[model samples]
Target: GGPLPDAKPLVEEATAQTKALKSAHMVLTVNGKIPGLSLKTLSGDLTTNPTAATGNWKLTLGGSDIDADFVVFDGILYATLTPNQWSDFGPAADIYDPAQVLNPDTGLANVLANFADAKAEGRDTINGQNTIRISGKVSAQAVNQIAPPFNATQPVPATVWIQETGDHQLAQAQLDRGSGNSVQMTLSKWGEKVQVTKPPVSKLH
Candidate 1:
């Protein structure tokens, strides 16, 4: 395909959280990875440590509110949030809330800044491109399980595209392990955009 020559991947950085309102049990398995993977934004949700490497991870979020955890390594990212022991948490998108979503964005931006810092600190470039590599971060803020939360943060594991001096394109993405809530996308065909804001609440629903 010779890089498509026209695709323009949109880059997004977010955090993962969990929430448990009622007694609902939801299991999310992206690409058929695993079972009991919860990332929601509600009560009884606990998140993992936001800055750790790839290793065994388990999260146990108490109470009935919003909680989050995050980590990065090599180039992969992992995040997990757990609710109470008796209740099951579920995934939700609450990026509008600073406590639930904004912190994740801060963590992710720090991760990117770390990458830039690493590059400046003498980390060799893996690819031959002249642009700097910027990876993707987690953005789910809730869970739907009742188990001890485990670790799930790794390095940004994908390549990004540089559109202009500051413009960026998230090339590939994925949830490497655990629930496999991973995603992969391309940006070799995007054009200029109009704006970036929360579409109507209907859009989130």
Candidate 2:
């Protein structure tokens, strides 16, 4: 209805909101040719201050499904390969920490800063909250941290949903791959308490 807010400044506001954010619930979904990453969907709670997380996950290897859960606690990564089979990858082994996925300096915020010719695409509702969607191109290298298999000579398209009012938080962000393949990340429950519990010493490692 109203003139859409400028995309450039809107991204800045949302970046600030994300940087100040304490905790949130996250879901990262991989679809289609699914990159080099093993985990399919990582859904759960995240907290900053070095960023710790724990949640349900599903991965596919050789077309076989591995049902499990993952956790990052005290700078270490551990996962259950099968039912109740926990394997420790390594200390400080977290490759992608959901809590820092949108940090201005370390995450998509940096990509947004370098967003090329970003444009606002009007408003929409996500998870029952109002949002302004922005579309633009960002460096391929910018998203390498999240999904490393991506290899492209040119910039890639990214669309983000930001809260329309209030603190202007980021509700979702997506990187589209042609032919209906993409990586989508959604956020919710801002400022909530999220604790990552360490696995039992006997079961860990």
Candidate 3:
């Protein structure tokens, strides 16, 4: 299939695609259209009609298999999922498992360790939005309990971005390794109403 005739508008107002319980939903708008499409069922270049206002959609794959929900609001993407569910989506290597990604310290130890000044590698932008991109390295020892030593020296990278509005909401993330595996995250919405309560600790095991 060829590209759209009026791709400008769809490109400007993109519709992000994400997995739903049994389907996928378009979360962006082009001229106020929901741009409904299904990733779960569609296969290979499903549709590309210029006359249609359907926007672009992104596909997320790999990770532990479990129920999860994604929302786009206030230019922020908020996701809520169980640890077990996260496991099904993929391995801990994909998403920085807290046990591996963060230092293992509880109570005061965690608080004191947090006091250390973290290094700021640099900054970048996503979708014309300003973002701070950071780089670091994680060791097997650091992440052994959370994620088995999948790789000895996994270069960890993270980016924090905010919406054009005053609120400093997280907008997107791109994590990668030299291997063919990677994760791409985009925020379609956010607000205080978005609940981010911690999942039950026991669920991680």
Candidate 4:
């Protein structure tokens, strides 16, 4: 109701609230350039909880299209891929100890923590909900620690939109990769129930 609060406490509170989040539905869009690739865009819908995540995604790179469904649970990854895509990913397309990008502690929280000069850019409305725009720069090493993994050779800039009401949850986030490419994610349905289970052995092949 009064003047907006300082940035540090606001960010800290947002981080705390995010850590308490149980599960959510996320829509992510990534577009731009990266090493060895000229143009790439990946969009997906994901459901996540503390220990597991499941989703479907489509990746378009250099005019080629690839679609897949994946699940990560108990530190293992299981993916169902098309024959065309399987050539690049192998049989099951599984990775042990895959990055748990939705985990509050190591994923979003860590990324927020690395914002060295974060400031409230201004206020804006997203989907009719009031939110504050926060922007800052982060270290290259920190950017590589999160999802849509990329290796950055220099500092990266990021922006986040946090809902001004309720517990000030994160509604959206964007990260720049220093290569004219960026990643954006939108979060909704907080506390939603998500169930993830491993695929059958027969399906692994």
Candidate 5:
């Protein structure tokens, strides 16, 4: 078959193809500084149905590069900055919730629906898979839900790649803030059963 006249159909499928899995391995990498409590890299496994995440991150807060292990389980955010020193980040945790990026209703997968002036850039090889590339402009409101630092409610350019076969999963997403800065997000091992356990109570600070 031939490509669709518009990229919307494909984007729509990808939106549904994702999130529905309820869980995946997520890796978010940033090329340069981003607003909010920007992080250098966040590597973890995220579950959407239960709405939780277990991972480690190097988040830059107060100009300090904090290296910690964090878990958002059972609707609470827990982080450990020191040996056996875990702290429940309180309300701020809501903003850092990993589910915020995978929620079927408002998460990153749904962000494609908010893309404007979307265009198909033909097929491209990503990592070892063939994917369809779609580029467009997306408002920060929708994009931020997944890739943070979005405020002032403006718009940014986004490029998305979807595997051309087998449920058309989202291969990758790149948010461009211009001037050689960009945020890249990748999802893999769809539906992989990851054990997201909570931090032991004895270690709570």
Candidate 6:
């Protein structure tokens, strides 16, 4: 079908609501096989600051084989890694620059906000709450600008579940990244307080 009446309004409302949320708890998971990659699963919990679109996240790979705490602040990424992990990864001081994946203006929320040619998929239940399902294609270049792992030449198919009532906040989202690999993110605890601070200089290593 063509674009839905609720599609544009839903995106606008959700995007505005997301920006005003301040803080939320997010859980993200990425799965499927990648050639020559040891990571089979990536999962993390993030305390997000929608205002800045950055946050503190604790990530685990392959369940428990690798774990790290990362902070994204002011366009820098700082990671806490163990000695063995440091040696194995061979990075400098555990400090690195990050892409714009978390930028409020061009990140996840913006992706949904800028969704092109969106259509109503149907109504669905997410986390036991009623939601409207919307489907669309987002620019792979836009997504890759933030998360570079995705190829930039292809269009990314996305499905989002939006709360049916109230503020029409996002309940969940799924992105199909070709192959069998995919990403899923769930949002909750909107308007919560999230405090993100830079690690002490002594802690950087």
Leading candidate by TM-score: 2
lDDT of 6 by residue, 1-205 (tens): 2333477788778877765554566666676743333433333333433222233344445566665555554444555576323212333224322323335676667778767788888887777787788999878876666555555567788888888778988887777876767777777776666565555545354
Best by lDDT: 5
Give the runs in model 5 whose Cα sits over 4 Å from its true position.
Answer: 1-6, 62-64, 83-85, 122-127, 145-148, 203-205
Query: If scored against the real structure, what TM-score would every candidate get?
Result: 0.26, 0.86, 0.29, 0.75, 0.83, 0.66
**Which order, best to worst by lDDT?**
5, 2, 4, 6, 3, 1
lDDT of 1 by residue, 11-100 (tens): 222111111111111122234323443334221112223211211223233533344433232223334434211111222222111122
TM-score between model 3 and native: 0.29
- RMSD to the hidden true structure, all candidates: 15.8, 2.4, 17.3, 4.3, 3.1, 5.7
What are the per-residue Cα lDDT tens digits for candidate 2 across 1-205?
5879888777888777776777888888877765666767879887878678888887888888877888888778788876676777776444655545646576756666656778998788999988898998878777665456665457878889998888888899888776767788898998889877887656333
Higher-scoring candidate on TM-score, 5 or 6: 5
Q: Which stretches of candidate 4 lie over 4 Å from their true place?
A: 1-5, 36-50, 74-76, 82-99, 199-205
lDDT of 5: 0.78
**What local distance difference test score does each model get?**
0.26, 0.77, 0.28, 0.67, 0.78, 0.61
Which residue pairs show collisions in model 5?
none
Q: Of the pair 3 and 5, which is ahead by lDDT? A: 5
Q: Can you write out model 5's per-residue Cα lDDT over 82-201, one digit (the tens) per residue?
A: 866677776535566667777877887668778787788878777678788889998878876666665526788889988877788888888888886788888788888888776776
- Greater lDDT among 3 and 6 belongs to 6
Higher-lDDT candidate of 1 and 3: 3
RMSD in angstroms between candidate 1 and the native structure over all alpha carbons: 15.8
State the TM-score for model 1: 0.26
Off by over 4 Å in 3: 1-122, 138-165, 192-205
Residue 137 displacement (Å), model 6 = 0.3
